[PDB]
Structures are given as structure tokens and as C-alpha cells.
Amino acid sequence: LSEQLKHCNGILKELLSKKHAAYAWPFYKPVDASALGLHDYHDIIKHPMDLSTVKRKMENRDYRDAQEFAADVRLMFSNCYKYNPPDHDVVAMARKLQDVFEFRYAKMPD
Ligand SMILES: Cc1sc2c(c1C)C(c1ccc(Cl)cc1)=N[C@@H](CC(=O)OC(C)(C)C)c1[nH]nc(C)[n+]1-2
Ligand code: NI
Ligand code: NI
């Protein structure tokens, strides 16, 4: 399951890669709610998450198993789906990146 964590790290690297940058970019760093004018963001989203935070957690050996990693990546998407109306541009981006994630996560070594 060090094997499994390596698969997770590969997925993370892919999500951050140029291949997917057109839709991944909003998820690169924490939402800066004040900068964006989203003064209700932290009232609605109790547990912010983004790919830089996932990357720091992976580098620090925070995640003890693949399931913990996947829960954080999915939290990041869920936050987007919670905050924004379903027809929003950023939601379309989240759905695309989540498709990339879920398909490759499903290829986890046993
Ligand atoms: C850096 C980031 S983080 C992010 C966004 C941006 C820009 C965008 C966004 C990204 C891409 C495109 Cl084409 C459009 C919007 N939207 C906001 C919510 C919003 O409504 O913000 C505006 C007030 C529209 C700025 C949002 N929700 N969740 C996330 C992760 N984001
Ligand atoms: Ni550990
Ligand atoms: Ni989960």
C-alpha cells in the first residue's frame, strides 16, 4: 500500500500536469475567498481543500492510505459543487478534472 500511495502520487502529478491545466488550474491553490470577493465561502465550506494542500500532505507522508488521499481529492470537488450553482463555469471544470481522477483512481493496484 506503499504501492497504492505511489499510484495516488502519480494521479496527483497528472492532475497538476500541463495535460489538464486548462480545467485544473482553479484547483491548484487554496481558494482565496477575500481576493475573489467570496465573503461567504468559509461560512459554507467547513473544510477547504486544493491540490497544493494534497501535494503537501503527500510530501509530508500525512496520508496513511489511498482512501485518505481519495477522500481529500473528492472533498475538493465536493466543495466546488456545494458553493457554486451547477451550471457555473468552474463546476464544468471540476467535473472534467474529477473524471480524470476517478478513472485513474479506479486503476489502483490491489
Ligand atoms: C482561482 C479560482 S478558485 C475558483 C475560481 C477561481 C478563479 C472560480 C472560477 C474559475 C474558473 C472560471 Cl472559468 C470561473 C470561475 N470560481 C470560484 C467561484 C466564483 O464564483 O468566483 C468568481 C467570483 C467567479 C471569481 C470558485 N469556486 N470554487 C473554486 C475552486 N473557485
Ligand atoms: Ni505515514
Ligand atoms: Ni471517499
Curated annotation (Swiss-Prot):
Q: What organism does the record attribute this protein to?
A: Homo sapiens
Q: Complete protein: which residues are present?
A: 346 to 455 of 801
**Phenotype for L38A:** Reduced binding to histone H4 acetylated at 'Lys-12' (H4K12ac)
Family assignment?
A: Belongs to the BET family.
Give a short account of what the protein does. Chromatin reader protein that specifically recognizes and binds histone H4 acetylated at 'Lys-5' and 'Lys-12' (H4K5ac and H4K12ac, respectively), thereby controlling gene expression and remodeling chromatin structures. Recruits transcription factors and coactivators to target gene sites, and activates RNA polymerase II machinery for transcriptional elongation.
- More about this protein: Some specific inhibitors of BRD2 that prevent binding to acetylated histone are promising therapeutic molecules for the treatment of cancers or inflammatory diseases. ABBV-744, a small molecule, has been tested on tumors with success: ABBV-744 antiproliferative activity is mainly restricted to cell lines of acute myeloid leukaemia and prostate cancer and is able to displace BRD4 from chromatin. GSK046 (iBET-BD2), which specifically inhibits the second bromo domain, is a promising therapeutic small molecule for the treatment of inflammatory and autoimmune diseases.
| Domain of life according to the entry | Eukaryota
- Domain Bromo: where? 1-108
Entry's free-text remark on domains: The first bromo domain specifically recognizes histone H4 acetylated at 'Lys-12' (H4K12ac). It also specifically binds histone H4 acetyl-methylated at 'Lys-5' and 'Lys-12' (H4K5acme and H4K12acme, respectively). The second bromo domain recognizes and binds histone H4 acetylated at 'Lys-5' and 'Lys-12' (H4K5ac and H4K12ac, respectively).
In the UniProt annotation, what is the result of changing N84A? Abolished binding to histone H4 acetylated at 'Lys-12' (H4K12ac)
Q: Where in the cell is it found?
A: Nucleus; Chromosome
Quaternary state and interactors: Homodimer. Interacts with E2F1. Interacts with (acetylated) STAT3; promoting STAT3 recruitment to chromatin. Interacts with CTCF; promoting BRD2 recruitment to chromatin. (Microbial infection) Interacts with herpes virus 8 protein LANA1.
Question: What is the recorded name of this protein?
Answer: Bromodomain-containing protein 2
